[PDB]
């Protein structure tokens, strides 16, 4: 068993009230200023010279929404996450050689961004269910073989 019905509830319900645009863009922009070296992977996204520039960069906004939409694929099928991020794994690994621990940094910002947005509703238990999900995602995006 990957998740429990209790966790599934925390994931699905919380995900239902999530605005992919705002949260996704917030998570990406925050990842790039808090952990500046992740910028290297984003060479074609224009201006990333300052926190303010990142926050107003439109390519960052757009890509941030696509990331959060991707997190939506995991939610739709929690027990098959691995197979879902199969394509994205080879892209993030084989093609775009990304350090595996970066998927973890990005899961940490998303959780913090979710906490800032949902406040007290983002209880310890709800957070626990989301750590498993973001953790499950980061893992699946790092393939060693096949």
């Amino acid at each position: 068993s990957d998740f429990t019905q209790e966790e599934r509830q925390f994931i699905v319900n919380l995900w239902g009230r999530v605005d992919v645009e705002q949260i996704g863009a917030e998570a990406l922009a925050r990842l790039l200023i808090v952990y500046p070296w992740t910028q290297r992977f984003f060479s074609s996204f224009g201006n990333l010279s300052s926190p303010s520039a990142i926050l107003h960069n439109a390519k960052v906004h757009a890509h941030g929404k696509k990331v959060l939409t991707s997190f939506g694929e995991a939610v739709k099928n929690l027990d098959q996450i691995k197979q879902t991020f199969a394509q994205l794994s080879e892209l993030h690994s084989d093609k775009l050689h990304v350090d595996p621990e970066n998927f973890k940094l990005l899961g940490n910002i998303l959780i913090i961004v979710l906490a800032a947005h949902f406040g007290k509703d983002f209880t310890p238990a709800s957070q626990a269910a989301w750590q498993k999900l973001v953790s499950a995602v980061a893992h699946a995006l790092a393939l060693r073989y096949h």
Binding site: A29, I33, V34, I111, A115, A116, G119, F122, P124, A125
Partner: protein, 141 residues
């Protein structure tokens, strides 16, 4: 390196943490233990019932320890030379956990003072929290 910018950003956040050192400290440990069950193994002798007495009391100890580092921000090591040997030499706590705790705390701040935890501010106290962890884990600088 903690720039004057980080320093002040740290002080502003701590002005909103002061007067809640017990509440926030108690919630910090709660998320840590609930979100990362493995961190509980360091506390076999605690009545770890989600929100018990020892959780809130230990929580206050930790968050108060943080506040000290905020006072002596310029020389965090010295103001923690005691806890360092505890966590480093005696307890020999796995360094990863410090990041999980530092993380658990930022999540508490996001909940109670989201507008304040701006990205530039987030960057600051996360540089400060890493400065604190390195000390409690011992490093040649």
């Amino acid at each position: 390196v903690l720039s004057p910018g980080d320093k002040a950003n740290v002080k502003t956040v701590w002005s909103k943490v002061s007067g809640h050192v017990e509440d926030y400290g108690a919630e910090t440990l709660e998320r840590l233990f609930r979100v990362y069950p493995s961190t509980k193994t360091y506390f076999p002798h605690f009545d770890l019932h989600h929100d018990s007495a020892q959780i809130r009391t230990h929580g206050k100890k930790v968050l108060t320890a943080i506040g000290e580092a905020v006072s002596h921000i310029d020389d965090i090591a010295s103001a923690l030379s005691k806890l360092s040997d505890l966590h480093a030499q005696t307890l020999r706590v796995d360094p990863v956990n410090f990041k999980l705790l530092s993380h658990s705390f930022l999540v508490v701040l996001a909940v109670h003072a989201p507008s304040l935890l701006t990205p530039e501010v987030h960057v600051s106290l996360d540089k400060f929290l890493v400065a604190v962890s390195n000390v409690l884990t011992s490093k040649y600088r």
